[PDB]
Symmetry: C6
Subunit: 225 residues, 6 copies
Amino acid sequence: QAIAKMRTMIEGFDDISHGGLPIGRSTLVSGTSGTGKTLFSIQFLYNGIIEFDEPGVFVTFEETPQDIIKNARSFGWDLAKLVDEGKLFILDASPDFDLSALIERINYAIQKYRARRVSIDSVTSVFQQYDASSVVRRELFRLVARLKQIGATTVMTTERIEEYGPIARYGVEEFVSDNVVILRNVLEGERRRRTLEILKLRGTSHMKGEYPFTITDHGINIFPL
Amino acid sequence: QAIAKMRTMIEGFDDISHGGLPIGRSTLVSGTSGTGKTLFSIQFLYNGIIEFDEPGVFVTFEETPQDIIKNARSFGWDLAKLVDEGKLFILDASPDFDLSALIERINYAIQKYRARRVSIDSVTSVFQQYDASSVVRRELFRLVARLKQIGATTVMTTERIEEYGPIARYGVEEFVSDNVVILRNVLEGERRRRTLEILKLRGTSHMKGEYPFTITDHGINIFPL
Amino acid sequence: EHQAIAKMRTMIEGFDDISHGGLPIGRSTLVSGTSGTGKTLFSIQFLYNGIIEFDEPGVFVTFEETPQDIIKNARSFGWDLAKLVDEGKLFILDASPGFDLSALIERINYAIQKYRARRVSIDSVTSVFQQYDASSVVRRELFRLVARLKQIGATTVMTTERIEEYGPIARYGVEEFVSDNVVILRNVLEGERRRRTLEILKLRGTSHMKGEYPFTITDHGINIFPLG
Amino acid sequence: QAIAKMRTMIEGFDDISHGGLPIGRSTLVSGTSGTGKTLFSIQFLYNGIIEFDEPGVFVTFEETPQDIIKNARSFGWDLAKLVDEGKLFILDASPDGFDLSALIERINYAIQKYRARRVSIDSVTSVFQQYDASSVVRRELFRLVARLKQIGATTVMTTERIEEYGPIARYGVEEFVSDNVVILRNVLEGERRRRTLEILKLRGTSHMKGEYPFTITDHGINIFPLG
Amino acid sequence: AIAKMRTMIEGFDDISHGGLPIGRSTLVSGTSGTGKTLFSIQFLYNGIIEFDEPGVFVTFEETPQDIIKNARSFGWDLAKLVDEGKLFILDASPDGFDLSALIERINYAIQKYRARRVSIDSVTSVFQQYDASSVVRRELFRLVARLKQIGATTVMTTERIEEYGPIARYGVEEFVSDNVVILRNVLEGERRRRTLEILKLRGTSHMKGEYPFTITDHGINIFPLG
Amino acid sequence: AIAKMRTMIEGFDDISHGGLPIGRSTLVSGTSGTGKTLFSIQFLYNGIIEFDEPGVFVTFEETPQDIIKNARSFGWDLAKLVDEGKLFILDASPDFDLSALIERINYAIQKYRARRVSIDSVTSVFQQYDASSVVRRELFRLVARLKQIGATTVMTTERIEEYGPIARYGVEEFVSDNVVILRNVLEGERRRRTLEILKLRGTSHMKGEYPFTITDHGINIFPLG
Ligand SMILES: Nc1ncnc2c1ncn2[C@@H]1O[C@H](COP(=O)(O)OP(=O)(O)OP(=O)(O)O)[C@@H](O)[C@H]1O
Ligand SMILES: Nc1ncnc2c1ncn2[C@@H]1O[C@H](COP(=O)(O)OP(=O)(O)OP(=O)(O)O)[C@@H](O)[C@H]1O
Ligand SMILES: Nc1ncnc2c1ncn2[C@@H]1O[C@H](COP(=O)(O)OP(=O)(O)OP(=O)(O)O)[C@@H](O)[C@H]1O
Ligand SMILES: Nc1ncnc2c1ncn2[C@@H]1O[C@H](COP(=O)(O)OP(=O)(O)OP(=O)(O)O)[C@@H](O)[C@H]1O
Ligand SMILES: Nc1ncnc2c1ncn2[C@@H]1O[C@H](COP(=O)(O)OP(=O)(O)OP(=O)(O)O)[C@@H](O)[C@H]1O
Ligand SMILES: Nc1ncnc2c1ncn2[C@@H]1O[C@H](COP(=O)(O)OP(=O)(O)OP(=O)(O)O)[C@@H](O)[C@H]1O
Ligand SMILES: [Cl-]
Ligand SMILES: [Cl-]
Ligand SMILES: [Cl-]
Ligand SMILES: [Cl-]
Ligand SMILES: [Cl-]
Ligand SMILES: [Cl-]
Ligand SMILES: [Mg+2]
Ligand SMILES: [Mg+2]
Ligand SMILES: [Mg+2]
Ligand SMILES: [Mg+2]
Ligand SMILES: [Mg+2]
Ligand SMILES: [Mg+2]
């Protein structure tokens, strides 16, 4: 029957989303630079491992595994240990148009590590890396559709350049994803404020509009209203 | 005589449209992501079947039949049963420029299932999937023309980026369709509000402007004013 | 002769007041609007009234909508276009699908001579350039058509598409400049409600009222309220 | 001495321009559709003929001479009589590597033949669009303007624009090549239109600034100088 | 400190804390009729009259004759200065893009007339005359860099379309120039107001923001504020 | 967590909670005349004078001599520092791949034992060779190699609006670890300078815009609480 959700245990998120992220579906998490997209994607995996012993695969296209690990120490998280224990796997897909080969490497890692959670950060970059903007819808669809067939629950980050403009970069990514989460970092009166919005969850309910959040030493904390 | 309408049974819609959707004509349903387009197009067919034993054909370019069926369980509708009974046919037109082949597959399904209601979701995506943005007016016209000839009553969804900008994506879709419905999901003061507007019905009358609506466990509910 | 230009009554309620007597004879009038503003309705009412009131035959040129659907939609208003086609008073010319309008223009001309038409509606010209990806040549080919119609002496309503209520008059930024006369139909959304207005922006060589005038579309077609 | 001006006798305009249009120079008159560009350019020639016996050449790329003549009857002007007397020439440059050289020599032939002091060219936008030559607008508008200055014609050239408060002309270069720039506006506010005329620039001389209201009536253009 | 040369344009030397940086390029950008040509002429004229510093004026469209005629509006006699060899007007109007030939022509004139000041009016136009927009940064950089090597002090005018939009036309010109002056002619409430701003002078100080100015029979007059 | 090196630019080390993250790249973006070059020169000069940390300055347009002359504006003697081998000005102006440039930078960093690197401006070198299609690829290659080398890098970039895109090509901020935005906002005919740390990966900083002034003593930023 109806879609089930997995608790993210990210403070306030499971309230906003009426239970967590839809299982076996993809969630687009989109935001301007420094909005906390990587943090959200890491905290998803980390909580999966710590709260439910669900292994996670982190796919990176630019940042090195070592820097992902190093930056997570800002939040007191020891990702190197989780890697050593085989609970976390960071797949380095950085450079040295068709996503089929990558998709197969990712599927391979999911199977190998028995992963229930996957984060991909950021899919925007791989198309720009290889001047492939003409084929974004088709290739993103290929990736999302395969992850659905595998039954992976996935967070995929993407980039945007305006807080109240396009949801992502090419005006197609939100339509391909099952779920859309928008992180904003709005500048008004010389000051910033962070908000999180669940725009869409296909096949299930969620709270609407923007909710304040903070990034602290404990990662993301969202305040439902 | 003046053009006849078929009831959608979508609460409030047949009020706003003065009796329903014009029979044998095409209706564009456009909106940003997560506005309720797929829901509207599913509810149209589902109601046709349950209320009038009127079979329907659902054309998908991306979402699988399985996920379409799963997401509809959010509302307590059992679409698998209807597929099993031959009352609903979900035509999978996802990938493995001319719409003739697609058109013939749709016609075949209309004649085979004896269907009078057709939903096509989303016609935007198919142009993007084959980079055929330059031929949109010509090919959307071919599609709509042929469905008019066949006598189908058709809901076609399309994608947009702004709540008050272009009706659809390419600036031509609204002019090729006989009828235009716009779903909006406006963000103001950090909160969303859903509205539906019937912009146009050729050859007949309708209520004007935006009417609020909600998506609940019973599908779309529009409040006429 | 040596008088200023004469006008032909549309008999569209209020329009002949706004236009100080109707549409200038032998000239082209652009009627431009977002989707659902009443462009087809205007262009139909122009021919229909010309036939019913003045026995002036009309030619309607369509590039997408079928004759049968044009006829059917006009019954919304209790008009019987089928009857008029039967009597040879209305001809609906189906023009549905380098780039050159010369052939089309000759077919239109042939139709005008054959039916002895005084009034012509072309709906919509926008679409034919989009149907063949011919935006580069719009000014030249639209001029070819308008100039030939003027030469013939036809009184023509040409509809065109726009996508903003207060942006460009038409789609390509040239159409208003090629036509002799320009009418803009708006359907403005404000505070969740729509309102319809009609503006005569320009009539070359003659006077008209200025600004937007409200109008409704009812069972009798377009009804415009002059203000003053 | 500084540049001299010829009177347009368009009511109000010679006050706003501190004397009239600079002699031997090109004046761009730009505006959205129906702002009065053709009317300004006709009235400029008509007044030249009637008040000063200064013959005029009118260059058209789309409107026929017969329609130009017919539309001027709206204002009670008999342009056919002036054509018959050899005082007005309407040069039909309608259609039937883009280069305006031949056009320029047809214009010069007319100027020399009619001993014309005044020239109106309407609209210069249209000829670039007719031949899909937008890429070359600055070079060929400059050729035209330079050649007319060489000939010493005082020229009104009309151009099209899409916004009341946006670009001066169409391609963002026309106002830079012209010596003088006048902007006709027809602003819609509160469902009502108002007409205003602005002299943006006259090279080498002075003029009033900002927008001045005007009306188009049976007597042509009438401009109200505020102060 | 880079040193400055007085423009002697009333108020400008106050706004710029002494004048234009010597041996460097100053971009002067504005919509049509803002006073760009006037500024660049007044710069050369004053250099001659006040300091006997010879000037070269490079035009791509306007003839020398019309430049001279239009300056009579301000009671300046440029013809006399051309005669005396203090002012050279270099007519570069027309009959892969590469400014090298023009640079050599400009360089020749600077040596011959021994010019210390140079005005180029307008560099926008030359790129559009030869549909060469794709290469503006590279070629404007070539021009600025060589003028600097020669040690010329240069005013280069450029065109813009909006009073509060891009500084120039191609979004690169301000970054190539050492110094940037924006002339505005803002329309508000049906009335125009002229203002001058010095956006940037590399390596030295200047006043900030917009200062009102007028164009009169005496040329540009800028009103410094406070 | 990541460590930080003090810039000693007055106010900045407060705003950044300690300085620039060591071994990472910091984008400094701004419209013309915002103080980008000045910031990147003060970074190296303070490094040399206060900590005896050698610096490499990379220029694509401004000559070494003018960089030196312009720094005299602030009482800094850069020619002396170049003479002592404390500062190396790498002239990369002209006479698509950034590999050559990168090997020259690395060589200069080894040779002069530099801890600090400023590159001014990264924008311009892509415009100089019309290589805008390749910005994200090539900026990534430069940033990645400098992270490997462990240099602490300031990279300036150009923008054309105060409240528009962070940089010029919509990708530079996503590739950099850290992002600083200098603004020069015109309002009511007056300019005001502000600095904003938009983002520091892996660590904390103050948010929003802070006023600053450029004086005879360089940049001076006022933190606000
Ligand atoms: N311990 C901490 N306390 C407070 N804020 C922190 C801490 N650690 C990191 N941050 C904040 O988190 C932000 C970094 O977030 P993250 O890398 O997840 O963003 P992003 O959206 O992925 O950026 P980019 O788009 O450039 O990849 C930093 O900019 C910093 O403001
Ligand atoms: N049982 C329910 N109760 C309330 N809301 C629900 C329920 N089920 C789904 N929804 C809402 O319906 C919205 C999604 O609807 P739908 O899939 O029709 O949107 P769409 O316009 O087709 O999206 P896209 O354009 O991305 O395809 C979800 O975003 C969720 O907010
Ligand atoms: N009997 C009626 N009473 C009231 N309004 C009606 C009636 N019949 C039609 N309409 C209105 O007339 C509008 C259709 O007008 P029309 O087809 O002339 O518009 P259009 O501008 O030509 O549309 P498009 O640009 O998409 O071709 C309908 O959208 C409907 O609101
Ligand atoms: N006798 C008159 N009284 C009042 N107004 C008139 C009269 N005759 C013409 N007009 C007005 O003159 C207006 C402007 O005419 P004109 O042809 O000069 O415009 P234009 O700017 O050249 O238009 P386009 O750019 O489309 O060529 C007409 O739209 C009409 O409003
Ligand atoms: N004697 C004068 N008194 C007042 N203003 C004058 C005088 N002479 C010229 N002007 C003004 O100077 C302006 C001409 O300025 P100038 O030619 O320097 O402008 P520009 O910015 O170079 O124009 P463009 O971009 O067309 O080249 C004229 O538009 C006019 O307003
Ligand atoms: N001694 C000083 N006192 C005050 N301001 C100064 C001083 N020296 C330089 N400036 C200011 O510093 C600004 C120059 O800064 P800088 O060269 O660092 O800018 P930038 O952002 O690199 O410019 P561009 O992007 O066009 O290269 C000058 O525009 C000037 O306003
Ligand atoms: Cl925070
Ligand atoms: Cl809802
Ligand atoms: Cl109505
Ligand atoms: Cl009027
Ligand atoms: Cl002034
Ligand atoms: Cl300051
Ligand atoms: Mg990130
Ligand atoms: Mg959908
Ligand atoms: Mg229509
Ligand atoms: Mg005209
Ligand atoms: Mg000038
Ligand atoms: Mg700099």
